[model samples]
Target: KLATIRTAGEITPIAGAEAIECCHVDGWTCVIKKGEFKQGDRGVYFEIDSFIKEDNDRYPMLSKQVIDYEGQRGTRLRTARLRGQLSQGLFLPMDRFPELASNQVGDDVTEILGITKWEPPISTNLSGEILGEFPTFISKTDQERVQNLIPQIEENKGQKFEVTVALDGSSMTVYRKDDHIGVCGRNWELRETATNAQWHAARRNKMIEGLQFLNRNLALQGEIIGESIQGNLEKLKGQDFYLFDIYDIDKAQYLTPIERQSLVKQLNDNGFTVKHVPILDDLELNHTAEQILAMADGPSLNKNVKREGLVFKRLDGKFSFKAISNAYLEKHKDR
Candidate 1:
């Protein structure tokens, strides 16, 4: 299995879809054959389960020090999907779970943007074993990558585009290998994460509804939010949200933006809910994000509704990871 770096949507498994960890963060758990939290220790190797949790039923499961701030919640932290019980200033019993400290912290520093990150992970069943491990993808570079994007955005301001009413969903390329369905995630087999409620709905929406799209030319991708999810636009009980542009597991096909759009139209014609990905040029990118966000039609953050963010793709389809557009992160913290 390839070591894929998943950015959007919950991960689903292929062969072993056993443990139904559900949606809770800390409630999910995984076993790491190795415990490497160093600069480049090759990561935790084998991973399955949530990287962070708070409930006692799962991986880093615990309910210790919590001072939930019912007041102002930030962007991602404000949403229920990412902020179930751990959002509003919640901490575990540091006095009890001492391992949570050494493993999860860097240089013993705590409090990330005022939000405490996981103290790595540890195995409670074993005594002299490992705790938690941070994956290399997230730790490869400091969040400075976010800061670096501002210039990239400005530099390539000519090649950016704003997509409105666009699509953001999960993708899976099913190869009919010897008459068996070979379903795979972005870059690996989804062992640790398989059944996130949000991801299940998204994948199914693409599968059953997007049956025609199961062809060999394009990959099967779908929105995994409430109602017809699209880029954090979930339509859940007055809630509107979905993740646009999930993934096309068939990484080899090399479909162009137009080709993918064509596939989506075919799916939509067959009574499926496929999203529209906008093709932005270099010129529009200077303010494309603002254009995309403004065009995003859904509930406001204050309403607790889940229409989170937007994604913009290139017009010609430069699907190289190194060429990935800058995810200009926005933070409200002045500190």
Candidate 2:
């Protein structure tokens, strides 16, 4: 489910770059070589997380997007910085396909266009050992990239959303199911072993010991970081956990923000030392998607350098998305 052909776009000039420019298409900003597109330009815009097959000659340059996937090869699109401007996807000239000239604004052309999502290889150190697949009763915490959900952004205009720093770290879960407390890495269930520091730290921190009242079906989720995890990207001197969400196993639903914060406090008071993700600001959704992306820039609260980016959550708990920082994208792409 990767291909989406957006029908309209608007080009915007970057602050200092001259050789390239950005075109805001839906919720994404696609940077194109200068003079190739201008203001008010409209075309088939494909968002990030998409893959355009290598067989298409019209997009010959897309060959550079090719990366070794699971076994074969495919072109995966992602947010990247070009000549200092941050862009999210590729904007194609629809004129190349006259037969599809009548395609509507929000038509999905993924199958016909042969596009797929780019899935990065998960490192074993990060994924840990596979005790088993993720539990089916719980929903994995996944957020739609802002660029892929432009229509939702438009529909929720004027709403207030709380913004928080999106940490680059391991997604950790400590849950109680059937009266058993266990730890999990991003993808797999893990046992507390030397090889899996995530499990060891969670057990050592007494994360399970502190959640006695979480009921037989409740779970807690957060990001775990420090010297040994995710390069301690936040520069946390030692291991630390930031609680952001909670789940009710029986109900199959996440807690409201207030409830999430209350659990964070409970965990910390019990000596789990858990904390909440840093909240940045509150904003009105009247702003355009491009403007919202603009606010994701800044230094990390834990470090002096550029951080990952921002996560925006609606007050009504209905919608949310992330705007990654250009600096972070540029730095990671180089690695």
What TM-score do all the candidates reach, one by one? 0.38, 0.82
Alpha-carbon shift of residue 307 in model 1 (angstroms): 3.5
Shift in Å, residue 23, candidate 2 = 3.2
lDDT of 2 by residue, 1-335 (tens): 35555644677777788877787766666787777766655466766667666654567768766767666576777767677666777787677656567776667777777666665454446666678767877767667777666778889888888788888777888888886777777766776667676776666667677677545577778787777665567777767667667788888877766666677777677687656788776878886666766777787767586778888878766577888776677677632
Best by lDDT: 2
Q: Ten-residue segment with the worst summed lDDT in candidate 1?
A: 1-10
Off by over 4 Å in 1: 1-146, 162-178, 182-214, 227-243, 246-254, 275-283, 287-306, 319-335
Give the per-residue lDDT digits (tens) of candidate 1, residues 1-335.
Answer: 01111111122222233432122112111221111121222111111211232334422223442223334222111111121221221222233344344443222222221332222122121111211232111111111111114334556665744342222233323223223333333232232235333334435545433543454423343222233322233334421223233234345433455666676677667866654433333335554332433434343322444232434455565421111121211221210
Model 2: residue 302 alpha-carbon error in angstroms: 1.1
